[PDB]
Amino acid sequence: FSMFRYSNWLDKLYMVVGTLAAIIHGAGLPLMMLVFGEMTDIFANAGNLMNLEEDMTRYAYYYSGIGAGVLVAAYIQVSFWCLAAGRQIHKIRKQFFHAIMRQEIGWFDVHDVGELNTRLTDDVSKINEGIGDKIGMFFQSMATFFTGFIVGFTRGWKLTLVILAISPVLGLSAAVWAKILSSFTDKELLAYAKAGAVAEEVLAAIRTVIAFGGQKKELERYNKNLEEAKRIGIKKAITANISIGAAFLLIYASYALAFWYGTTLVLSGEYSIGQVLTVFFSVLIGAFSVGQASPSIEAFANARGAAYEIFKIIDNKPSIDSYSKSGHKPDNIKGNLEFRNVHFSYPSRKEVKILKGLNLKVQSGQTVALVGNSGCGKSTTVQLMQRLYDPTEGMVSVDGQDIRTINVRFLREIIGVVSQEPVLFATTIAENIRYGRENVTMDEIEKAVKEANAYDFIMKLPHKFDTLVGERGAQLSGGQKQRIAIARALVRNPKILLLDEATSALDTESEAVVQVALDKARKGRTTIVIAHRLSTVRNADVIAGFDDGVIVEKGNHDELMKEKGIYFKLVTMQTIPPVSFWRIMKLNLTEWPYFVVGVFCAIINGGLQPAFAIIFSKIIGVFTRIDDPETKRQNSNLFSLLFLALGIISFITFFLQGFTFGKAGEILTKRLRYMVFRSMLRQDVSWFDDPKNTTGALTTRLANDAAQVKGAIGSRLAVITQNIANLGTGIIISFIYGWQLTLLLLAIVPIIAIAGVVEMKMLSGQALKDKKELEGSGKIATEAIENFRTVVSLTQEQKFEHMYAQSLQVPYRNSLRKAHIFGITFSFTQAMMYFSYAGCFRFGAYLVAHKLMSFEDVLLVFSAVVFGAMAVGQVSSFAPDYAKAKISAAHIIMIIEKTPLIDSYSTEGLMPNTLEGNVTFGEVVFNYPTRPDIPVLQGLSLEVKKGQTLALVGSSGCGKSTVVQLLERFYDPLAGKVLLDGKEIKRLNVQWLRAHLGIVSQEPILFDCSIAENIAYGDNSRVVSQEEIVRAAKEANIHAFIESLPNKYSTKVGDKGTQLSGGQKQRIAIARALVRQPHILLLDEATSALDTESEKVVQEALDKAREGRTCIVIAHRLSTIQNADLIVVFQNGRVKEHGTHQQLLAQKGIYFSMVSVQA
């Protein structure tokens, strides 16, 4: 795939013409230098002696002409190329969505929905970035390179050879530097990936860590990793700065050598100095445009893969052509389905066969139904019924004709399908119903909604035919949604209607009306029903028993019952923070002996450019002086050597300039992370529960932060320093040497700087705000791709595609306008730069002709100002992006400055010696901070005495774990008092309490460490001797299990407990909890899924240690209730049953009912 631009042959006119324009623009610059060379000679000749006004004026005319030529050529290239890119991208996006909507259902099953959606959303943008702007830039760069070498050879015979001989050395050195930088970057990536794995492991189990209060250990480990992270980061920054310095040094060495040799030759009577100027400038500019081209080829290579994938999808041909119009289109469709030996297997799992052959004939006006055990395949049966799939081995026909023979669209349009969980499109209810059929009028909608028995629901909500189905728009009830879907199906005027789990839950009266309407449609429409309610099959015209992919039962309900088949058995069983640089300089603490050196080096570097202008103007002036003794040679030689120094110093300072800055930033990282992380732990778990603080989000903020803030502070300061130094020094020194020309160039500078920044951003940031419009239009794509099943079911694909086309045409013209605007901007910038030469040198000719200054002086001012503006633009655009960095810095400032309500880091809390162990919850009422309105506690109460075996029971999911979580003060209680030993719980030491108690989660978490260390992790603040760990393990009865394993406890835990089985993992967790010997123990489903003997051993250990050790127990096994000292049952946030197990059993009810159900 190298030629994938494959649309709008006429648009190819833009492709070539723009390219052509690029060529000339690329060639424009060396030509401009050519004349400049000759131009200089004129001055050098004229000063060596007058009619300079006319010659200067005609050269300025040449410059203006070439400038206008560029003003046309650059605009043409950029505009035309972006036009072609935009048009092709629009066409390919339309075709891509069209192809996706045409794919087969099984293909969607295999291919991830989110991957495909993000593919559409991002790869098209990648292709857009891979053509238009970048291609124009590449062609212009290559043209500039070629033309520069051509000019060098033509006007230069020996100097060009030496320059082009030096160039490959520069190329090799730069490539080596880039490779070294990439290697260092990858090594640092891995080095920090270590610490990042550690951070992920600690954060993902924040509940356990905060419960055990192991904050210190985790923080110490993270600091340990951060040390190596910082070391390698410092190495990387040093290497990057040294590479920059080496590039500078090589460039200035080339300058020195070229001017040395050219001065030698010209002193030897060779071509004039102007010839040297033109040849050197042109050759170097070409030999650096060659490298300037590379980003474009990188972008094109990137886009090649996206194009490959997208075209591979597009060219895919599906067997079930949902769009093919060649299929038969029967009209007199008498209701009749006939499946013969129908065998099927899901394409995702071809090995597993669901249907093992099936025969079934259903005649017109028949109510057929399917019944079977779990996995009976009824759902797959109906799916294959609508022709969504094809029969693996068998045949299916409608009205006596094979299903395949008929057109897929025609067959689909005559089949109503209602799933077990319909969802409506996020739009108006009228639109949702209209999606059933296009040619449907509001009267038809009224009739359908009346039939579905929902007119009251529609007329109750405001905007009957206008209520949207978006966020809070689609708040309709499940029954209301089912009614809406039924109405949609009815509006389809289908022949065959299939339904499954029609009206699960909710009032049956709505189910009654739904069934009545379905029966009324049954008068003429064949029906298939997958319903669990007995009444559904009570009047069913026929019921078929699908078990193990075999249809056995055949007959009415009475007939099947008389055979005592599975039907009878089933029936019986039924029975944007604000930031600021002043407030953001938190690194000054570790920056005082660093920022001073940084600013010093930056000042030196900035002044370096005006020094180069001084030397350049002096060298040129060494030949405009008429004295012309032999000393000129020496003079030139001397100046040449200065370049080398002007080069060498540049490297040295840079080596220091990075070392103070690169290190500084790195240092800041080692603080900021160690601060950020340190702040994260000292926080309330509620904050973690929020979706904003997802583990991935926290690790991204804690990892993709160093470079951000480092840039925002250090790089901003350094770039600003260098910019101000360079430009201010240039302006001042220009004013000293000449006034009028300095004023004119000062007037022109801002245009040059704007042009430089825009050119630098041309190849980087072409698509920034387009993503907004793309997302705005992509709601349709997300709808269709996510909900594709219903879309294909009711054949609404065409309307969705047309809607997408409109939504995409909304920004299409905007994209074309953006293309034209960018082209005009770039072209005007280039032309303004070219006119700068003409204006400045014409004014200089005027000045010199009146002895206002020496040509050396005007050249000095011109070079100083122009090159200063261009270099300041370049260095400003080379820095890492600031706005994103400032935003990230502000975000992390918010994170670090955040102070928790439960200051676990705070040591303020009553710490009485020992504890009585009486836990009292009175009118305890609280709700999750995520959903405070929904109550989790309803004034529940619980009184527990010292060493009292308390058991908690209730409906699964009632909020049992909520009480345990509150015991750790993870979430504050809205109402009621929680007291330990008759004391204010909140008034106690939060850390002291969290250490005193002990809790085993319903799903204990184990860190990747040695078993001994993991067990000892339970009790922090003091190393637990191996004897204590062994005793605890024996108490939990796992010591033998660990000793059996190789290396004993010394085994390294596999990822996610890979090495150890969950059964042993739960026992290990129990041992860890018991190690601390907590005053109060909390076990939540401690039995879980394990051997009953393991639960017996754990209970025996707890009972042995139970005395003087209060316990709270939750589980779904009744055995735990037998030995409970006291029992309690939670009911809707209120404890209903209180007392002993025997007393509760005698008072038959919730406890007795639960025991009977389970037992």
Ligand SMILES: CC[C@]1(O)C[C@@H]2CN(CCc3c([nH]c4ccccc34)[C@@](C(=O)OC)(c3cc4c(cc3OC)N(C)[C@H]3[C@@](O)(C(=O)OC)[C@H](OC(C)=O)[C@]5(CC)C=CCN6CC[C@]43[C@@H]65)C2)C1
């Ligand atoms: C205003 C446009 C521009 O100036 C165009 C280039 C990139 N930037 C400016 C900064 C810049 C350039 N060179 C610098 C040296 C030190 C400090 C800064 C620079 C610029 C150049 O050569 O000067 C005219 C340049 C830079 C590069 C550059 C090209 C380039 O213009 C010639 N390449 C894209 C890379 C580079 O790694 C590469 O792979 O070349 C194919 C390249 O090495 C070479 C020459 O091979 C080089 C040169 C320093 C090596 C290591 C770091 N990478 C990052 C990008 C790359 C550079 C010029 C913006």
Ligand SMILES: CC[C@]1(O)C[C@@H]2CN(CCc3c([nH]c4ccccc34)[C@@](C(=O)OC)(c3cc4c(cc3OC)N(C)[C@H]3[C@@](O)(C(=O)OC)[C@H](OC(C)=O)[C@]5(CC)C=CCN6CC[C@]43[C@@H]65)C2)C1
């Ligand atoms: C309309 C935007 C723009 O085209 C962007 C630049 C500046 N001007 C256009 C004219 C221009 C540029 N170069 C010219 C040479 C002679 C005459 C005119 C030019 C421009 C370029 O090279 O486009 C390919 C450019 C030029 C430079 C340029 C950047 C640049 O844009 C790519 N650099 C700022 C300097 C430069 O010397 C420097 O930054 O180091 C001190 C730079 O060398 C390095 C290390 O990049 C370089 C270009 C290779 C080298 C030798 C002479 N110095 C003086 C100015 C500087 C240049 C391009 C306006």
Ligand SMILES: Nc1ncnc2c1ncn2[C@@H]1O[C@H](COP(=O)(O)OP(=O)(O)OP(=O)(O)O)[C@@H](O)[C@H]1O
């Ligand atoms: N794309 C798929 N690929 C493979 N198996 C699938 C796929 N979709 C579903 N299955 C499973 O394959 C089996 C096919 O049975 P099917 O679900 O059609 O019948 P069912 O008894 O009506 O199902 P259910 O219990 O979901 O109501 C089920 O276990 C189903 O969960």
Ligand SMILES: Nc1ncnc2c1ncn2[C@@H]1O[C@H](COP(=O)(O)OP(=O)(O)OP(=O)(O)O)[C@@H](O)[C@H]1O
């Ligand atoms: N992060 C959370 N934020 C808010 N509510 C939550 C969160 N996690 C779970 N819940 C809700 O809290 C209740 C959890 O019940 P809890 O675990 O406390 O008791 P349980 O009887 O052991 O039940 P289960 O183990 O099924 O959750 C459920 O309502 C669940 O929806």
Ligand SMILES: [Mg+2]
């Ligand atoms: Mg099913």
Ligand SMILES: [Mg+2]
């Ligand atoms: Mg629970």
